[PDB]
Amino acid sequence: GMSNKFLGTWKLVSSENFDDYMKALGVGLATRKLGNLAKPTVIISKKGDIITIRTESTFKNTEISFQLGQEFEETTADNRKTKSIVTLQRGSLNQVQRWDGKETTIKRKLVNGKMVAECKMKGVVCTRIYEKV
Numbered sequence: 001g002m003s004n005k006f007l008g009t010w011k012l013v014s015s016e017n018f019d020d021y022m023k024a025l026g027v028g029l030a031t032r033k034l035g036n037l038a039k040p041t042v043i044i045s046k047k048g049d050i051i052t053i054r055t056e057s058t059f060k061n062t063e064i065s066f067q068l069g070q071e072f073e074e075t076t077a078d079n080r081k082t083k084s085i086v087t088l089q090r091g092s093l094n095q096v097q098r099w100d101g102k103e104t105t106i107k108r109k110l111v112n113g114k115m116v117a118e119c120k121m122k123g124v125v126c127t128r129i130y131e132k133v
């Protein structure tokens with residue numbers, strides 16, 4: 001399963017191309033403003049086989065709980081209602097969200113102790129890097 005090194009409290013330290021990723025998702029300017037300003041905290045936890053990813057920011061929280069490989073309903077921070085699946089590939093924790101025949105991927109991997117999230121929509125790529133408290 002998921003490496004235990006994913007578990008903990010993560011703080012965003014850099015973000016590349018999030019505005020165009022949000023545009024790709026159809027997010028409007030006021031909400032993009034909040035997304036570009038936020039320095040969220042991402043807490044990854046696990047109890048038995050249930051993985052939880054909680055995101056906290058000054059103006060918005062989200063939380064998902066899932067089992068690997070089992071599709072679940074998700075309401076994203078930009079209010080998309082998606083069918084999502086999280087899988088594990090070469091130790092990368094890979095989330096796919098599907099809605100209205102669209103899809104986006106959020107792939108989270110550990111690189112030299114940091115968590116690197118690659119977000120892709122319509123081939124637009126954003127990279128968000130986190131360090132662990």
Ligand SMILES: CCCCCCCCCCCCCCCC(=O)O
Nearest residue numbers: 034035038040057060077078117128
């Ligand atoms: C984090 C909340 C900010 C406020 C609103 C943001 C709305 C855009 C959400 C786009 C999807 C977020 C992808 C985040 C990937 C990650 O965990 O780094």
Ligand SMILES: [Cl-]
Nearest residue numbers: 038039057058
């Ligand atoms: Cl914030």
